[model samples]
Target: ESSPVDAVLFVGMSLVLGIASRHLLRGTRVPYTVALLVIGIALGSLEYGAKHNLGKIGHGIRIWNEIDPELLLAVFLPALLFESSFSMEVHQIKRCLGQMVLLAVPGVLISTACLGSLVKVTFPYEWDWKTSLLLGGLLSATDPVAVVALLKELGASKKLSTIIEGESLMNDGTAIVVFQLFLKMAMGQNSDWSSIIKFLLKVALGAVGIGLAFGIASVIWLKFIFNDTVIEITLTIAVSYFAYYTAQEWAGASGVLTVMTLGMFYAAFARTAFKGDSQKSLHHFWEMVAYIANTLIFILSGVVIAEGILDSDKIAYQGNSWRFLFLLYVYIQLSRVVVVGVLYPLLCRFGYGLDWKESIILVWSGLRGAVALALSLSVKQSSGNSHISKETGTLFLFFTGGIVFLTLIVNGSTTQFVLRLLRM
Candidate 1:
């Protein structure tokens, strides 16, 4: 197997591939997710037929038997979410706030419910309604990183961009909150009816509150300490941690929401604190963060794949199962249409300049990414010592990761075409 040499070759391939993908995507319509996953799968599968021997990693790879929930959520997710929210234009986001809330909150709910039903209906052998809902929850969050990046590159409509970004960023907390609720119910916890309402209001609102506090506070601090880019950067670091940790400590609240809200706040307030050079420094910092975060996120995807999912014996995935899940995936995309179709027009009555093309783009453009994988992996971990089969969660996690990869890679590459067709 040349285990030691294979390890070096793997990492070397990842870097060279990332650089090449970055360069090639410059003028092409092919999206980064397509490039990343295609390259990832190729590199990851190169030694697929080889015998197993853990060299540098040794038996440490065993703990990775189940996907590491903490690694996906606590490590990779924070950077990605922070970078997305930080870079968003606050005014554009606020303008579309009403539409975002409608589509993101209500839209995600409809998609979750619809997806659950559709999947259950399709895969009658594998999952009951309960398990189906759990899977739906796993797959519901939209991955906008690649989509947003592509839109910006194409010089797509600003309105469409904000709506897509706004929904994706804010919907994370909502999706996670509802996903946990159903998970608890499935685990035989005394499900609270009022808790649903509380989550809709309190947890959601609390994250926004916490974020606003840190963002504004950080922004003010930045203004006072504008002379030092280092100080301002440190302040942002502190705020990200504070917003996240504080929300985590609070019951039913979301750290993702806190970070997202903080991102918006930082955009509003902290962005104005810097002068010319400091502005460039701040831009450079965010650019560097996004680049590194994107690389690490994709690399982790490869690492997980290398550690074991495709090789798992417990999960018996049929070749045709891809079609079933893909259909379920398509239903999710369509449900977004049903959602935004209704919500955008109604929202236009308010301040938001909602349009047909933008709304269509918003619906089709929802790419489920790392958050879905992280949440699914979390589900896999939380099933410890459980009455239900471990394979159930692990298989479901694999499926969720599969959906993320497919939608991100396949759909992501085609998003530019979709945007052009929609005339966005």
Candidate 2:
């Protein structure tokens, strides 16, 4: 019922709250992710409707449905991914490319299979295989924001952080591809194994092709362009959005991978194209863009969760929501253990082996965040009685939100404690 203006205002408020919360949480062990989430819940609890007018602008701002999932993914995800990829040390990623690839690709698939199977077997509700797999794919991508924060602050080894950061960037792309494929199937698309494989290959290859094309082009353009910071920075921004839209709209490819690839390519090669202040300016500009995008997405996630949970009249087995969330948390962790434990030992056969401590930390650091919850919100509601019920959709929302909250509070807060306990 709200207009676009209301949505805009809501987002502006979310950014303000997110930035202030981060500033206020400094010099404390509490993660900003946790604080922003709580702030979202509190904000959502308030009445921002037409009744409570603040400066006459708050009258039109309706919190619910203000930030839809598609808008969130389209607007925020590309910038966040690009920033993460741009800031990464390309040399480090190159050094650990093999390990990173294994963890991001097959590692995600294994986690998806394990977690999906567990959901099918353990859940009291009857979720179809495709829906369960969709959930698995959605949650498979890890958010290492809090973990990276600890690493930088506590002086963890650069290798560890690079591995964690690199894996997060790649796995998000993989998860998006898998989520899309399964989503189509869940929507009753007729997809066979051969077709699925073909689709995956097409999307993956096309994304890479498009990304490389745009990335190289950006580099060439920037290399020839003078030391104009505005032009150089604008080119990079255009390339990010261009890479995503081109791949997704034109090639039916993975937009996430496209922008990620663009960022890495730019960082590795094109970044040097700019001279002096331009280089530093470009970096800082993108960093700020990513900061705002990430803040907006996470806080909005909290807003969505709070509103949905509080207004839930269609939540199935409402009393058992907690039990489902508890079991899901355990399943997700167990799946992570299986993937890390199994893969790392195998990776050890080669020169890219992680020690037990490193492997264990990797297992524990698989915290879910904005991406997972965003994808869950993006899950398309079914039609009529042939699809998932409204109650089921509501439960899925609760499950996603609850898991995000639990992981942020439990894994995020305890990661430092575990590191200290293990004396890593």
Candidate 3:
């Protein structure tokens, strides 16, 4: 019913709103991402009302619901991951690499365990262990976009920023792996301990191996082809997509992990492989791609939330939905505390010590966003496993949207306050 131009106009207007949101909230504590989310909700509500009431206005706002979630993920996710990794200075991160790895892996698993347990106990429906773990794995991903932005604004030390950013990058991969593992179990796939162990090894190692192979080959090709900046930039884009595809399709590995590994590997070699105009061009290109991608995804989060809330049967959620949302929010925050507080102290002996102030900041900085929203949308109730139902999946999606909203507003808004209180 719509042309490509419709999509373009929709996105263009959204990006404008996203940029305006940043400027509009400049002096306020509300984050740019959070502002975009609220704007998205407002726009979504307009679309809803126009459809149900104002017929002509509906035509103007209907373009948003037409945006495919999968298409958004496919295009935006890789660019966001690659840009963050590409921007990172490997040398700066190398010092805290051990700490980053520690925090990302065990940190995610520990959170999954704690939160999953809470889900089993608190949810109104009788959720099984595997399903609870799936929710846990989904929530385990920490998105530091808002936190990192605040950090830069506050003039935080590079080491602290690197650690937080690095941990989030790695945590995403770890959480995805855990999420996939639990997803398989929920789908009535291999659930035995030995099989689970084997699957984890295959997925983790294969992703890393495939990414390194692609990254190295691409760098070599770029070096040999020298001076073709446009092609070099195109190659990076190709590698980001192909690496994820090949790792997932051919190697039975984690797609997110593959892209992240490729990004890190490529970053390590990028400076030497491309010189002068080529390097600068490539950097600017990806930066723009990343900005556009981030802008769209954050706004879309609000769109997704609005669509879900508006469509749900109001009578079903009339009174109890708040209780459900509030409880889950508390459980998620508590798990973050348990994981970060406990793990950092244990790992402190390895010289990754975080003083209480740093620990608290890290805890509050565990804000969830785009990836969690994507995973929530992607979750499906397997027919083979009758324990979960369509309603449960719908509930999970809404819960995810609500949790993301709260984290962005509550945790995100307070991050600057925490920094000021600690004077860090």
Best by TM-score: 2
What is candidate 1's lDDT per residue for 116-143, written digit by digit as tens? 8877787754665666787776678876
User: Candidate 1: where are CA atoms >4 Å away?
Assistant: 1-17, 39-49, 52-54, 57-68, 125-130, 198-202, 223-226, 249-252, 305-308, 312-320, 381-388, 418-424
**Which tens-of-lDDT digit does each residue in 156-263 have in candidate 3?**
876577778888887777888898898778876756999788998899788888888888898789778857777887888888987777877677777778888887
| Candidate lDDT values, in order | 0.65, 0.73, 0.73
User: Between candidates 1 and 2, which one is better according to TM-score?
Assistant: 2
True lDDT of residue 379, candidate 1: 68
Candidate 2 on 247-365: residue-level lDDT in tens? 77778787888888887777788656778887678778887887777676666665555545565333532766767788899998899889987787566554346877888887888
Scored by lDDT, model 2 comes in at 0.73
TM-score-sorted candidate list, best first: 2, 3, 1
C-alpha displacement of 136 in model 3, angstroms?
0.9
Model 3 scores worst on lDDT over the 10 consecutive residues at: 49-58
| Candidate 3 segments exceeding 4 Å error | 2-5, 48-50, 53-72, 188-190, 312-316, 380-388
Q: Please report how far candidate 1 places residue 31 from its true position, in Å.
A: 2.1
Candidate 1 collision pairs? 143-367
Model 3 residue 349 lDDT score: 55
